Structure 1
């Protein structure tokens, strides 16, 4: 009888965790059995040695994750869609250094402060008040003893990856300082028109290679520029995203495409943000098929709150227009402050999705409300660790949310900055670290399907996506089963 109470409690928890009610077919049961065997063995060994990758910093754990049979299987998995990504954090930096810096007319410089910076131009730009002298890379590489070392020093400046990140990044402000500095540095490389096209195209290649078929991207839409010095506008960038995605889908008929969530920094004046809201509405009218809506990005702890921006964020409503929102919210360790209430305010503004929602489990009422309105959180485990919200991903607050089957999708955020690629590394962390030992094939399947369900595609486009994904899923099942 007490045995029955015990078994009942275990079955209840089996049922309410994420994906726990999905019915598996006998083929899937077989794949799950082989998957779980590999998982359990790996966890037993980590319990013995205490070498457990999700509990270590991703920089040090990455090489271990790459040796994992579980990771290997997750690489193969059709993961659905990547829903939380940033314009310039989605392509391995290797290609930026080895390919892009070797292209004609690439110039390098250093600010009065010593911050690296790039520009494609002809001829050499005029010394300005942010760059005492510009220097062509082809000249610079001739004057250096070890070229391969100079190149590696560029790669080390383009990511956060380092040994001893605990010593390098002493606090959250230091890490955010370096983070943003990287965006600034690589900016001049990516926003040169023919690199921009190649960049967009390559990010689709990398995610397609990771078995991800759809992408929604938070994009600042900064001006793209030509060798002449001409600057393009927001319209032109959205047109280009559409065009490159069409070109990609033409040679990869299973890839669904990309949509754009227009974004601006939360460190700006409400008046500037009001200007950005109008742009977003204009972009929606002009490109209703490409532009999903709007978001505010940047260091959440130090910038303005959603409340601070109420006047600007209500503009669409006052014009009787619906501008969908996809707010970053509650990406913080603070509890009961103006920052974690951003989740509440995102919900009050009818957000379609919540970015991160890290502080959600500390607010039971908001949690219930979001679950009731079926508004998912976009969880990005590697980002949260690297940006120092949580050391050991076993302690990630989303573990509680998975345990009650909360609506959520997994994404990678800025994989390239963390030394990750695509979506598989983040699926590893969720499946091995956050979900615990009982997270199974159902958890994975549910998370894959969620990413199609909570995308901004039309319902008929969702069906077509489901159709394509189901077939890739069966193929995956059959492989793992043998």
Structure 2
């Protein structure tokens, strides 16, 4: 829909390597096949036929990482993701990515993130502020649930060093059937005690103890919340933690059986803060405009209700007050139009 495409939007939950253009992923595959590193037909088959249920999508991510883990590619896809979000009028983007180590190519977590910064410096089609369309970009560093406590601490230390190029917080993500909260809690507590903002993937699978322990940590945001129970909802509503809602992702991974029963409607009606997000618009073949369209249809929102929802996301960002004031100005300058 045209007016949804033109709506200024805020993206808080987008994984870099889950946001790659189809043609770019297949071009990387083709180039690596011409070098003999992979069998192009096999990789292409996985990309087309992986059903992207919660179990299968992490195998897909292993394949994506075999295609994308080198400095030049990280720079390229960072630029492409930012340009794609800006062209659908995302005015503020928190981009999250897991820094990667790869000794065989001389990649450290730090040099991975430097390739991300290089990608932001190469953005040309739009105006960008990371510390004619204009987009504010800020960065979240992801801890993957496969990692050790010490490796998670390395990521937190890097985030603290990189506050000067717009890192604002830390994410916990990766396969929810892997790893234990006790592994990551000490590193996340260090991050929080050093004033980094914290967002947690929470309740993607049934796990009552882990959900309660993540809620008691009091992160600044959580993502998904698909298998919360009533005591979980009560605690979340009392702590006022915003929820990153990923409609398409949830339906495809089979974490929520349909949009008509999705908890985002309850949160909306309970006046609990929620933000519509893409999660992985490349993996799940969507866009932030389409997520808004699904939500507007399902809830039956008017233009002005949709605009109020979009604007409310400003106070869930991890950005400094000056940036929030600028976002308020932008949204107000798009306010009386509709």
What TM-score, normalized by structure 1, do the two folds share? Answer: 0.61
Over 3 Å counting, the alpha-carbon distance change for 1:356 and 1:172 in structure 2 is closer
| 1:160 CA displacement | 5.8
Q: Which residue of 1 aligns with 2:212?
A: 344
| 1:356 CA displacement | 1.4
Over 3 Å counting, the alpha-carbon distance change for 1:350 and 1:238 in structure 2 is farther
**Is it true that 1:425 corresponds to 2:290 in the alignment?**
yes
Asked if the contact 2:245–2:274 (Cα under 8 Å) also holds between the matched residues in 1, the reply is yes
Instruction: Show structure 2 runs of 5+ residues with no match.
Output: none
Asked if the contact 1:159–1:416 (Cα under 8 Å) also holds between the matched residues in 2, the reply is no
Structure 2 counterparts to residues 15-414 of structure 1, below 5 A: 71-78=1-8, 80-97=9-26, 100=28, 106-108=31-33, 134=37, 157-158=46-47, 165=51, 172-173=54-55, 175-188=56-69, 191-193=70-72, 195-222=73-100, 229-231=105-107, 233-234=111-112, 236-237=114-115, 239-244=117-122, 248-249=126-127, 254-284=133-163, 287=164, 290-300=166-176, 302-316=177-191, 321-332=194-205, 334=206, 339-360=207-228, 362-364=229-231, 366-414=232-280
Residues paired across the two proteins, number: 334
Q: Which residue of 2 aligns with 1:18?
A: none
Distance in 1, matches of 2:272 and 2:95, equals 23
For residues 259-280 of structure 1, the C-alpha deviation after alignment (integer angstroms, 9 at most, x for no partner) is 1110121023334333333333
SS at match of 1:399: helix
| 1:220 CA displacement | 1.0
For residues 109-154 of structure 1, the C-alpha deviation after alignment (integer angstroms, 9 at most, x for no partner) is 8xxxxxxxxxxxxxx6xxxxxxxx547x9xx9xxxxxxxxx6xx86
SS at match of 2:25: helix
Q: Which residue of 1 aligns with 2:334?
A: 472
What TM-score, normalized by structure 2, do the two folds share? Answer: 0.84
Asked if the contact 1:256–1:465 (Cα under 8 Å) also holds between the matched residues in 2, the reply is no
Asked if the contact 1:196–1:224 (Cα under 8 Å) also holds between the matched residues in 2, the reply is no
SS at match of 2:181: coil
SS at match of 2:18: coil
- Structure with greater Cα Rg: 1
Asked if the contact 2:128–2:137 (Cα under 8 Å) also holds between the matched residues in 1, the reply is no
Over 3 Å counting, the alpha-carbon distance change for 1:464 and 1:470 in structure 2 is same
Asked if the contact 2:249–2:279 (Cα under 8 Å) also holds between the matched residues in 1, the reply is yes
Over 3 Å counting, the alpha-carbon distance change for 1:229 and 1:178 in structure 2 is closer
Asked if the contact 2:15–2:95 (Cα under 8 Å) also holds between the matched residues in 1, the reply is yes
For residues 157-179 of structure 1, the C-alpha deviation after alignment (integer angstroms, 9 at most, x for no partner) is 43567xxx5xxx7x743x23443
Asked if the contact 2:83–2:125 (Cα under 8 Å) also holds between the matched residues in 1, the reply is no
Distance in 2, matches of 1:325 and 1:344, equals 16
SS at match of 1:391: coil
SS at match of 2:138: strand
Asked if the contact 1:346–1:354 (Cα under 8 Å) also holds between the matched residues in 2, the reply is no
Q: Which residue of 2 aligns with 1:461?
A: 323
Instruction: Show structure 1 runs of 5+ residues with no match.
Output: 1-70, 110-123, 125-132, 141-149, 478-482
Over 3 Å counting, the alpha-carbon distance change for 1:101 and 1:472 in structure 2 is farther
Asked if the contact 2:29–2:43 (Cα under 8 Å) also holds between the matched residues in 1, the reply is no
